[PDB]
Amino acid sequence: NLYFQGMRFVNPIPFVRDINRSKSFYRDRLGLKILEDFGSFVLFETGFAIHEGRSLEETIWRTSSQEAYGRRNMLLYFEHADVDAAFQDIAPHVELIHPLERQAWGQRVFRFYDPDGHAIEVGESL
Amino acid sequence: NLYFQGMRFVNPIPFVRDINRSKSFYRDRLGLKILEDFGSFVLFETGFAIHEGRSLEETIWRTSSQEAYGRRNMLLYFEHADVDAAFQDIAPHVELIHPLERQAWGQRVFRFYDPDGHAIEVGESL
Numbered sequence: 001n002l003y004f005q006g007m008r009f010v011n012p013i014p015f016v017r018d019i020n021r022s023k024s025f026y027r028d029r030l031g032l033k034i035l036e037d038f039g040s041f042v043l044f045e046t047g048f049a050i051h052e053g054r055s056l057e058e059t060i061w062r063t064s065s066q067e068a069y070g071r072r073n074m075l076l077y078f079e080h081a082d083v084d085a086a087f088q089d090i091a092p093h094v095e096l097i098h099p100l101e102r103q104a105w106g107q108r109v110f111r112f113y114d115p116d117g118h119a120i121e122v123g124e125s126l
Numbered sequence: 127n128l129y130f131q132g133m134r135f136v137n138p139i140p141f142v143r144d145i146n147r148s149k150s151f152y153r154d155r156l157g158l159k160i161l162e163d164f165g166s167f168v169l170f171e172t173g174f175a176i177h178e179g180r181s182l183e184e185t186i187w188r189t190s191s192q193e194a195y196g197r198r199n200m201l202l203y204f205e206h207a208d209v210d211a212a213f214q215d216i217a218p219h220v221e222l223i224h225p226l227e228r229q230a231w232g233q234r235v236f237r238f239y240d241p242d243g244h245a246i247e248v249g250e251s252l
Contacts, residue, residue: 005207007157007248009174012138013201031133047173048135049203056201059230060223060237060245069199073244075139075182077175081131097186104185111186118199119186122133 011043014076015053015069016116022050025115029093030078030122031086048076070117083108083124090122137169140202141179141195142242148176151241155219156204156248157212174202196243209234209250216248 016022023042026032033045040052057064080086087100087110097111097119109123142148149168152158159171166178183190206212213226213236223237223245235249 002251004251007172007204007206007212008251009158009170009172009202009204011203013203015199015201032135044135046133046135051201053199057198060201060247061198071197071199072183072187073141073179073195073197074200075141075177075186076135077137077139078133078135080133086133121186125128125130125134 011047011049012074012076013041013049013051013056014074014114014116014118015056016050016114017053017069018115019050019052021115026050029090030120031089048078068117070113070119072119074119075111076114076118076120078120078122079125080122081125083110083122086122137173137175138200138202139167139175139177139182140200140240140242140244141182142176142240143179143195144241145176145178147241152176155216156246157215174204194243196239196245198245200245201237202240202244202246204246204248205251206248207251209236209248212248 019040027034032048035043035045040055043049053069054064094112100108100110102108107123109121111121114120145166153160158174161169161171166181169175179195180190220238226234226236228234233249235247237247240246
């Protein structure tokens with residue numbers, strides 16, 4: 001929409017140590033589709049993106065030094081049409097936080113880490 | 127779309143110390159529109175969300191203790207139709223990382239911190 005006025009959230013951009021590691025994780029394990037691959041930055045369909053961390057830190061702050069980028073300060077929330085199939089397909093390849101469990105609000109979700117330690121949730125569709 | 131199969135990114139959920147502080151910042155300063163307000167969790171139009179951090183940490187990990195949630199490990203990327211107006215309206219009320227500047231790729235953006243220290247970029251529309 002060329003005519004949208006005011007503010008629009010476009011993408012979160014978690015920082016990653018290795019763009020190939022991450023790209024392969026999100027595309028091969030989570031089944032995301034690449035919209036555009038710029039090398040150090042990858043945009044996925046459905047509004048997710050990742051960026052090699054040192055290059056983006058230098059762009060923003062003009063300096064960078066580091067611990068894993070995953071820092072228990074955010075959750076990346078995804079939904080899947082068939083959460084049981086997603087769990088079967090993903091769980092063996094990730095470090096789970098917990099298995100597929102009904103939450104207090106009735107939705108079944110599982111939670112796990114990406115290769116950099118960022119926290120991810122995959123829930124059944126709402 | 128009830129018929130979407132496979133994986134969809136829904137929301138990033140940065141953790142915040144004070145949901146009212148944050149809600150007021152994103153709605154009053156950045157001009158975001160609340161889609162739904164659950165108290166400890168707020169969904170905005172255009173796919174952004176925030177959650178009080180300790181409650182979400184307890185939900186995920188069953189424990190929480192903390193430094194500011196902003197931890198130079200992600201960038202939240204927004205676009206505005208009139209980046210000059212956005213800058214005039216926002217800059218005095220935030221701690222800037224840098225002012226409105228043409229980037230190496232030709233887009234004018236500014237970058238700043240939210241109340242918890244998360245890094246935000248507002249760029250002209252692409």
